Design a protein around this ligand. Sequence first.
Ligand SMILES: *[C@@H]1O[C@H](CO)[C@@H](O)[C@H](O)[C@H]1NC(C)=O
Ligand SMILES: *[C@@H]1O[C@H](CO)[C@@H](O)[C@H](O)[C@H]1NC(C)=O
Ligand SMILES: *[C@@H]1O[C@H](CO)[C@@H](O)[C@H](O)[C@H]1NC(C)=O
Lengths: 49, 49, 224
Amino acid sequence: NYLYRLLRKSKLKPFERDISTEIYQAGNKPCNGVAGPNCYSPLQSYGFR
Amino acid sequence: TGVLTESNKKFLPFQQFGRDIADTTDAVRDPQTLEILDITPCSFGGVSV
Amino acid sequence: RTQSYTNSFTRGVYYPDKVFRSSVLHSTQDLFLPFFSNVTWFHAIHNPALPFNDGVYFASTEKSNIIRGWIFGTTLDSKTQSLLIVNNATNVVIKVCEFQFCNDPFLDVYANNCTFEYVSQPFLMKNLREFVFKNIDGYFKIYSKHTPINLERDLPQGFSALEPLVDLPIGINITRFQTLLALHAAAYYVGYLQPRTFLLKYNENGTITDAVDCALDPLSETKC
Ligand SMILES: *[C@@H]1O[C@H](CO)[C@@H](O)[C@H](O)[C@H]1NC(C)=O
Ligand SMILES: *[C@@H]1O[C@H](CO)[C@@H](O)[C@H](O)[C@H]1NC(C)=O
Ligand SMILES: *[C@@H]1O[C@H](CO)[C@@H](O)[C@H](O)[C@H]1NC(C)=O
């Protein structure tokens, strides 16, 4: 239930909150809303045990 | 430490402090009654024998 | 809509802090509108988004009280708490709540989660009104001033310092902004702030009466 953001396009300003979850693309081929090759969702759980 | 005196300074309503050349507090606004009070130091000087 | 261009004419100076100073020359650094700049005059009879590039100076020389409120944000079609300001003859209720509102903001004289619900005196009462908005460290600051312009031809000469009214405690990612209109036309100036250095002049009453822009010409650099 606890998530964190792996990566963004740029840095974060102080006291700035980001809510919108868009599939990041790190290549020329667009993601088009599909988490396929070279398309990763930025929100991944901590996994506390 | 100082002597508090009633003033005639034209404080704008968003201003609460006054500052001098050396950035010391010259006038202050009382938080209970909306009044302007000047702060002047107590009497002092040199002594020669 | 129609775009024109006008010299700013040493206009758009605000009080940099809430400290009374009198009979002193003070040198400050903030986000100021530079002197003799190139502001844009918009005539609204007709509307893409306008950039918010490190702060916006806003002015209007309208007597009929038609321009009413602003919206700030990035997308402005729902999806994000953005801003909302309504200024009628009644109170001046500011909201952060989005509305999913149309691309032609006309008012008729015939939403979602909410954050801020301020109610204050009427802003709008020869009634030139200047506004300055800025976004630093997640804080939204608003400065305003009413000026009785005599000859209504352009932005007048002289000095009129801008005093703060409202400090909103939060705001994130403002890049675009728009205006709103009232129908049963509109004409406003938009200038962009920039981190310049100013030499402010205070009189005996604590009122800013003159300023020097330290990066305009070599004479003002010598004065600074
Ligand atoms: C605090 O004192 C001032 C001065 O008498 C008064 O006007 C104000 O109502 C007081 N505040 C409260 C909460 O009683
Ligand atoms: C402002 O910029 C426009 C852009 O082309 C230019 O035509 C105009 O002359 C400029 N105004 C000045 C330099 O006063
Ligand atoms: C300060 O304000 C008073 C009150 O109107 C005025 O008489 C005086 O001329 C002002 N001082 C200036 C403008 O230097």
